[PDB]
Amino acid sequence: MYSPTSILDIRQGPKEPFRDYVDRFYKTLRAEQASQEVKNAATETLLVQNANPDCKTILKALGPGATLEEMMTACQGVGGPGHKARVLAEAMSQVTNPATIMIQKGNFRNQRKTVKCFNCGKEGHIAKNCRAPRKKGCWKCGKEGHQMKDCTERQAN
Ligand SMILES: [Zn+2]
Ligand SMILES: [Zn+2]
């Protein structure tokens, strides 16, 4: 399941640290590095277009003040994945620019169905924060199986 067409797509999600999603692009790039000529030319526009709107937006904004690793770190944890900074920034942006209603309408095109808690079934929670042995068992290393009670995270995540 966790090896779909998304691996060919590898587009960065707004919560995803740039280099982390680029990491799995790099794992494909290291393999299919036959046409290096097209690959390198692609990666130039590809990785920047691969970013979430906000991410490529900041890249070009802080580019002058961010050499290379700096701009990479800038897009690592955009406003912090679990930080409240991003959540308030989303509200600050919302009142400031009317472009937020446009992307709000565009949100209808986006499958925002990730909110539904992948263990409880409903979107009352978020699976990222909801730690509850409801069903399925081990979602960590087995997904389809393994005892969730004996699944201690060691050299995995
Ligand atoms: Zn839940
Ligand atoms: Zn497990």
Side-chain angles (χ1 to χ4, degrees):
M1 185 182 181
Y2 300 86
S3 185
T5 311
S6 313
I7 306 299
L8 288 57
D9 162 88
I10 52 272
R11 69 85 182 118
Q12 170 188 28
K15 78 181 201 302
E16 218 73 43
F18 185 71
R19 188 65 180 221
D20 192 82
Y21 222 138
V22 177
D23 175 74
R24 52 262 299 184
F25 179 74
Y26 185 79
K27 87 186 296 185
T28 70
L29 183 65
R30 72 185 182 211
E32 61 186 287
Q33 57 173 271
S35 185
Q36 303 170 271
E37 51 180 85
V38 176
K39 290 290 182 292
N40 185 87
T43 57
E44 299 182 273
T45 177
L46 186 276
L47 279 310
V48 298
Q49 176 67 330
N50 176 273
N52 64 276
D54 201 269
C55 174
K56 49 241 281 303
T57 296
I58 58 175
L59 280 176
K60 60 207 298 178
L62 42 78
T67 310
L68 193 284
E69 61 291 90
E70 314 187 85
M71 63 171 56
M72 184 178 64
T73 306
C75 302
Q76 285 177 327
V78 184
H83 286 235
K84 316 297 173 294
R86 57 160 44 206
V87 183
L88 69 88
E90 294 182 289
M92 293 276 71
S93 182
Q94 188 182 30
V95 62
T96 306
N97 62 86
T100 44
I101 67 174
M102 184 61 179
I103 190 174
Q104 197 283 148
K105 186 179 72 66
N107 187 34
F108 188 62
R109 302 174 302 213
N110 182 31
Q111 299 180 271
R112 61 182 299 218
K113 215 65 177 179
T114 326
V115 61
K116 56 188 177 64
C117 203
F118 299 98
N119 66 329
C120 313
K122 303 185 299 90
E123 66 168 282
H125 329 117
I126 50 281
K128 61 184 67 179
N129 287 27
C130 185
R131 45 178 179 176
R134 302 289 297 200
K135 36 170 150 58
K136 293 304 196 295
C138 159
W139 327 273
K140 204 66 168 57
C141 85
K143 200 287 177 56
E144 290 301 307
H146 190 244
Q147 296 173 89
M148 46 64 180
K149 39 168 56 61
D150 279 84
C151 203
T152 185
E153 314 95 306
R154 182 177 177 171
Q155 197 62 31
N157 183 268

